[PDB]
Write an enzyme that holds these catalytic residues in place. Structure first.
Site, PDB file in Angstrom:
ATOM      1  N   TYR C 120       0.952  -1.315   0.319  1.00 10.37           N
ATOM      2  CA  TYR C 120      -0.022   0.285  -0.105  1.00 10.37           C
ATOM      3  C   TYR C 120       0.249   1.725   0.302  1.00 10.37           C
ATOM      4  CZ  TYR C 120      -3.702  -2.907   1.064  1.00 10.37           C
ATOM      5  OH  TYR C 120      -4.216  -4.286   1.196  1.00 10.37           O
ATOM      6  N   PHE C 396     -13.261  -1.831   7.273  1.00 10.58           N
ATOM      7  CA  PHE C 396     -14.102  -2.222   6.675  1.00 10.58           C
ATOM      8  C   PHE C 396     -12.697  -2.201   5.447  1.00 10.58           C
ATOM      9  CE2 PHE C 396     -11.798   2.091   6.967  1.00 10.58           C
ATOM     10  CZ  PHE C 396     -11.498   2.338   5.963  1.00 10.58           C
TER      11      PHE C 396
END
Ligand SMILES: CC(C)(COP(=O)(O)OP(=O)(O)OC[C@H]1O[C@@H](n2cnc3c(N)ncnc32)[C@H](O)[C@@H]1OP(=O)(O)O)[C@@H](O)C(=O)NCCC(=O)NCCS
Ligand SMILES: CC(C)(COP(=O)(O)OP(=O)(O)OC[C@H]1O[C@@H](n2cnc3c(N)ncnc32)[C@H](O)[C@@H]1OP(=O)(O)O)[C@@H](O)C(=O)NCCC(=O)NCCS
Ligand SMILES: CC(C)(COP(=O)(O)OP(=O)(O)OC[C@H]1O[C@@H](n2cnc3c(N)ncnc32)[C@H](O)[C@@H]1OP(=O)(O)O)[C@@H](O)C(=O)NCCC(=O)NCCS
Ligand SMILES: CC(C)(COP(=O)(O)OP(=O)(O)OC[C@H]1O[C@@H](n2cnc3c(N)ncnc32)[C@H](O)[C@@H]1OP(=O)(O)O)[C@@H](O)C(=O)NCCC(=O)NCCS
Ligand SMILES: Cc1ccc(C(=O)C[n+]2ccn3cccc3c2-c2ccc(F)cc2)cc1
Ligand SMILES: Cc1ccc(C(=O)C[n+]2ccn3cccc3c2-c2ccc(F)cc2)cc1
Ligand SMILES: Cc1ccc(C(=O)C[n+]2ccn3cccc3c2-c2ccc(F)cc2)cc1
Ligand SMILES: Cc1ccc(C(=O)C[n+]2ccn3cccc3c2-c2ccc(F)cc2)cc1
Ligand SMILES: [Cl-]
Ligand SMILES: [Cl-]
Ligand SMILES: [Cl-]
Ligand SMILES: [Cl-]
Lengths: 396, 396, 396, 396
Positions: C120, C396
């Site tokens: 990331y 999430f």
């Protein structure tokens, strides 16, 4: 960063590097014994300037290949790059120099044992023997009615102290190594080393015992932490009788739950028992790796299976030449040619085929050797196979 | 204690025995599906009088043997003796009756999967295929430059729901099973069963996915307790391209640490990778066991290696006759004789040789087959070997 | 290989990909609930042509940052590339398109939870919250004399069924999330989802219970395999009294040996006990990751520590502009400039600083932010620090 | 049961008690070396009459606190009560006498390492440093482009034998300890002891190696049972370059799977890698514990953060006086007062704040320090924080 043969003054730096690089490091006393197998100019070191930050060497060995032919073999070992000098091209430089010296000295093959399986293929080495660990739960072990050495009389096997029967072990091993592909001559210094390891060490390994038969021996010891496990470090047998008799004695170790051995895939032990499953394969790994230095000398020196009929082909080794290969009557002729290739493979693939442990068909299925003729594959499979199953002698 | 074919009323008692005897028991719904493969008179039960205390049966199967020959095969299964009636001769009686019926019906071979490896040898069954578990740590896995299906374009493999591509799996499997020794025809009911297992179960196995290539498929699922392990339940490939492409996709499962599969000893997977060691052999066991019911029909039906030259010998099977065996041009003739035997072996040993998974030399080294001619051993080794490596189809 | 917004017909293919990519996959019913948080044009798919081989999306979230400021936030999720289409540039293409849409829509920040910590950083995301697992051996747990809620009367905490007190949990959580950096608004559908997970599942998770205080709650359940372990899935407290009282009740679970919770590094629990060591840190990992989409909007929106005196500097973000940064009176001004930079850092580094979880000094020591002025480092450390400790809301 | 300073004749009884009380006991030879740090009257013993049934002592140490100030420090150690004389008030009596002598001798602080975390709070000691174990799986470890010491040339780090570079380690450590809060002077005898432990022991620890840089060193060894684990016993670095270079060398230990170190919470190592998660926190515990003996001397001796503006408050320590505390320009004045308290805390709490490892806000949330002014909390948090992160020197 220079590359050269070490002087006497370099060896302490080399042993320092070794102690930091190899957990199983042997200490200076025994390192000096193994050093007697390193020829003049058999070692290289890389100095920073100055301390030693890279080393590699080879030992003069004698390897048995199918047909009971014994080849001079360069056994690579003691290879190390300092953690401070990784990814700097040192290994590639040391390997290239050693390979040059090995080739120029006249070795048809080089060989090694791999610390990791992914470093060596790119330098032309292919895995050529397979190690199989068998663990037998000896509490359930029963021998088959057909198994030898269960008649009605005395036993031919004796339980003895290793150090008192050195000469009998030497003689048995010498016979073994000359008739088995993968066999290595074990010189005097390595018998000195082997028998020294047979004694117990304070807070280390336990005492080793031997089972001795006129045509075989087994060396074993109880595992240091699992006291119900006996580890057979070495079992060498020349006849089927010797092999069965030794296993009858090993299964008679009634203090142990389990007997384990590092052996080969064709070990007949499982077929000696009424329940073949009792001999569990607990581990499987590559053993000896081979780099063929001279393709025609190596291919011509080896014996081949008589069962296959005479055939001829053209073999390209990727950066190792192209040859007309003719095989018949268990012998091969291998000569230069510029005719179109029928078989291509990298050099490491040829090493993997060379002692008969891997099938050409299997390597073809992975596209590691290319051909557009399946009849030829069948022929290579059959020709390169070994009558006597390939085994692994000792680690170096 | 009588022995007879079960009536419809016996089946609930049989399912009761089954539920208590087999932990992997399949439940009555699926048991009734497998029952469609049991011929009339293919089952025996032993009643106490009265309840059922023993059962055994066989299924009508089609087995591929070397030379791509398909044989009618009696697949023994569902064998059980109540814990209350052990050591009473029930198994020996049930096996003898089934073997009589199998022989009289015209099956040249029978076969089974062994719950334990030491029960079956005495009834004439020898282990004939070898199962190898490979576990790949896919985080380190890199494919070799030589490996197929890594050019520069789209992928030929798709990730799909098993139940939506039944016809493509059927067709691929059918091709596979006809060309591989050990192949079995999978009838419709067994595809029904296989695809039903593909759905997730509450507090059981997870959903199964498929990777589909025009010439191969893989079925897999995440392990129920180890969520970093993917288990390939079945991988079937007809070309080397299909096999490599499927493994490229499996190694692309970036959520998993490890991919495992139950495969065979000649699986080329390890040679597809740059580091052969990454494909660890975590388990090894016998697969299909074979009892040759009719020695001459079985030996004559099989194809043999063309590479070995014509030879003739005399084979005694211990309680299965003596035969003049002539092998040449990949075919065998096997006729009665009273001439002196050159090779002797028990019947189970012949089953172990029959699909080419074990070498005669290796069985000879355990004295499980006797001969006083090593040239003959080499010849048998070569002749009985299988060009296409032997595999295991599915458990029954 | 085209890239576009999915149509209704693409969603089954997306759920197929999801089931194969995510072990914790939620099933279609709940996936359809989470889908209500995905705006129009918030999703991309990659089709092979045709099936879906890549997907990614974002959800509309509201994130609290220091100073109790609430920012619109794009929460990346449901990102997946088929195992058949790895190393083909799909992720880079999907991320670039989503980032374009996110930037053009007016989000000052994006955020995500990382399946692996090394994917990331290169897309501009830095880890911005830290998760700490504490495991308390409650058998030895004794509260300090100083700890609140141990006077002499009734208890303020009640043991209740989660589903019967939804409104009280909602209200408590809403207060929590508005005052804590890292807080997220939890919409109605996510409360529906949370309370559905509170029920026991056959061969799955056990029933969940709640401890309810006027200013806090804890949700917990016994671990499915370790029946002496209680797992607190969520503990939310607005006052110190509520937090202590809830932990008094949790430590009163006399059937359990251990209570565990995923919390944050500044959780005061260890200081509530007489033996601080009893609260063992059993796990530590990055929580929320942040990509600052608009540097000046994000830096100006956040509140800063009043304790540090006014200062001005110049900050270059590696491919995100150069700014004159003035901070004083707990506010910042951030304007364009071409003056020489005093501080440089990649964009992900700024995300890691943004909620006060990592110190600029520490990132400087790794050379992840460069400056030649240590006084400035001290000033940034102090200014970016958060009065209220940073926490992680929900995954999430 | 009398309490007094031991005579020479008491030491054998003390060593007997020590051998029975401490598993890590050091033996008489090394105990006699550590004894050179115990001042005259620095030890107490309790005799039964007669044998020694209780002992405690302190060592003369030099502790670095924020602002690079070095304080005389009484390091409690070797504390033990015979198992035969538990719960008899011996510890309380020995601690009270030692504390009296320590206070009267002029030490502003005492310190210790805790065998258990729940014994010490009641004697005024608070945990003041935090130990963090990081375990790096070095097979996946890759350094960030931004990380120092990866240019294009030689390495600055050398692999060496510890005993041959004592002087360079001493000099590096001396620089380290003077600039880091938590630093301790390591006298000659402790270097003697440290280098003696560097040698391998038969059936004990393995040989230790060192990585040496002009501005740092690391000492490490392979774990005795897990041969794929290298344990860094000590890493001391003065520059960020030294720290990165040493970790580049440690990650170049290609024989190891894992490198572990006991470090501090602000170790920049995780930010040196592309995947921050690879540096797993495997353990977390309190390190040095502090008892402030003289509140005004300790508070006035320490440096404070310049960033916070001048402020004044009144601090009550529960049985340690009440003081007017004025902090500004990085210095504090602390004078007696009877004005109303704005902050109260037990004495151990003050020790926990003293080196900047715990935030006043966090201790307030546990009600371990009381105040009715949150602005004051923010001010204390900021003032007591340490620019240079707090570390733990060595165990005593
Ligand atoms: C030697 C050593 C520790 C690393 O050496 P190095 O100096 O960093 O390697 P070099 O830079 O000289 O070049 C080695 C080549 O192999 C690769 N390589 C080296 N070690 C590797 C490893 N452990 N794993 C994977 N690849 C490796 C390098 O990438 C390089 O090729 P590339 O530059 O084309 O990618 C490491 O290879 C090692 O583990 N020992 C090697 C053992 C060996 O080859 N023989 C001894 C067995 S007795
Ligand atoms: C059938 C069963 C449970 C025991 O049956 P049983 O009625 O006690 O066996 P019987 O008395 O009929 O005779 C079996 C012979 O094999 C032996 N035997 C049977 N089960 C055995 C076992 N589990 N282990 C070792 N030997 C066994 C017996 O000793 C006997 O020979 P012997 O009397 O010459 O020693 C047991 O053999 C079993 O585990 N299942 C057998 C599975 C099988 O053969 N086929 C099914 C695979 S699908
Ligand atoms: C997406 C995925 C499975 C692989 O995707 P991909 O299509 O092969 O990646 P791309 O080819 O588009 O490019 C990705 C870049 O990152 C690298 N990369 C991708 N996945 C990686 C992984 N698992 N580990 C390390 N590097 C990775 C690639 O090398 C490439 O960069 P490079 O070509 O400059 O080296 C993989 O990255 C994955 O595990 N999921 C990513 C998760 C994510 O980013 N967000 C979702 C969290 S909710
Ligand atoms: C010293 C020792 C073994 C027990 O000593 P003791 O003589 O039984 O203790 P005393 O009776 O003198 O009084 C100790 C007080 O602390 C408590 N205490 C002592 N050891 C304790 C333990 N292991 N756990 C919890 N409480 C303990 C006692 O209850 C007593 O307080 P109380 O009477 O008000 O309840 C034990 O405390 C121990 O483990 N070592 C203590 C280590 C230490 O304090 N410093 C050395 C670190 S280098
Ligand atoms: C000069 C010299 C040469 C070799 C050696 C040996 O000790 C070789 N040797 C022998 C047996 N072994 C069993 C396990 C490991 C070994 C090692 C060994 C050591 C280093 C390697 F890279 C590979 C093998 C020592 C000194
Ligand atoms: C009538 C009937 C016949 C067979 C069956 C089956 O279920 C056979 N079968 C199939 C697949 N399997 C995978 C693992 C175990 C099996 C079993 C099985 C069952 C019993 C055995 F002795 C050997 C095998 C069920 C009913
Ligand atoms: C359309 C849609 C969007 C999101 C989802 C969700 O289920 C997201 N979600 C929520 C909570 N979670 C807890 C653990 C894992 C999750 C997942 C999740 C799923 C995939 C990811 F890449 C990252 C997170 C499902 C459907
Ligand atoms: C007189 C004398 C004084 C101290 C000692 C030491 O050996 C102290 N020392 C040093 C280092 N260590 C590392 C782990 C444990 C230690 C111990 C130690 C011993 C006892 C304790 F209560 C606390 C610490 C020995 C003798
Ligand atoms: Cl030899
Ligand atoms: Cl078939
Ligand atoms: Cl919010
Ligand atoms: Cl100091």
């Amino acid at each position: 960063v220079t590359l050269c043969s070490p002087t006497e003054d370099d060896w302490p730096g080399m042993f320092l590097l070794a102690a930091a690089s190899f957990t199983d490091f042997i200490g200076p006393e025994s390192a000096t014994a193994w050093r007697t197998l390193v020829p003049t100019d058999g070692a290289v070191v890389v100095r920073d300037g100055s301390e030693v930050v890279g080393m590699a060497l080879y030992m003069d060995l004698r390897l048995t290949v199918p047909g009971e032919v014994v080849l001079p073999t360069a056994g690579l070992s003691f290879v190390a790059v300092a953690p401070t000098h990784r990814r700097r091209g040192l290994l590639r430089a040391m390997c290239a120099e050693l390979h040059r010296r090995i080739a120029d000295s006249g070795y048809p093959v080089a060989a090694l044992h791999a610390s990791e399986g992914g470093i060596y293929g790119r330098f032309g080495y292919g895995p050529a023997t397979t190690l199989h660990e068998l663990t037998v739960d000896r509490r359930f072990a029963r021998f088959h009615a057909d198994a030898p050495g269960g008649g009605l009389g005395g036993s031919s096997v004796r339980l003895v102290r290793p150090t008192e029967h050195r000469g009998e072990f030497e003689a048995i091993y010498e016979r073994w190594r000359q008739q088995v592909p993968g066999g290595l001559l074990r010189p005097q210094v390595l018998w000195d080393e082997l028998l020294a390891e047979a004694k117990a060490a304070p807070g280390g390994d336990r005492e080793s015992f031997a089972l001795l038969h006129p045509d075989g021996y087994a060396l074993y010891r109880v595992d240091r932490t699992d006291l119900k496990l006996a580890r057979v470090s070495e079992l060498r047998a020349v006849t089927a009788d010797a092999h069965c008799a030794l296993w009858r004695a090993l299964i008679g170790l009634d203090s142990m739950e389990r007997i384990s051995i590092i052996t080969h895939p064709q070990d007949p032990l499982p077929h000696l028992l009424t329940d073949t499953r009792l001999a569990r394969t607990t581990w499987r790994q590559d053993g000896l790796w081979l780099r063929i230095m001279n393709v025609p000398a190596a291919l011509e020196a080896r014996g081949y299976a008589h069962e296959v009929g005479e055939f001829s082909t053209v073999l390209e080794v990727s950066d190792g030449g192209r040859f007309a290969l003719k095989i018949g009557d268990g012998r091969a002729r291998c000569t230069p040619t510029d005719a179109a290739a029928e078989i291509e493979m990298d050099r490491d693939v040829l090493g993997s085929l060379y002692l008969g442990a891997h099938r050409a068909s299997t390597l073809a299925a992975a596209n590691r050797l290319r051909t557009k003729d399946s009849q030829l594959l069948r022929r290579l499979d059959a020709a390169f196979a070994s009558d006597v199953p390939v085994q692994t002698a000792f680690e170096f």
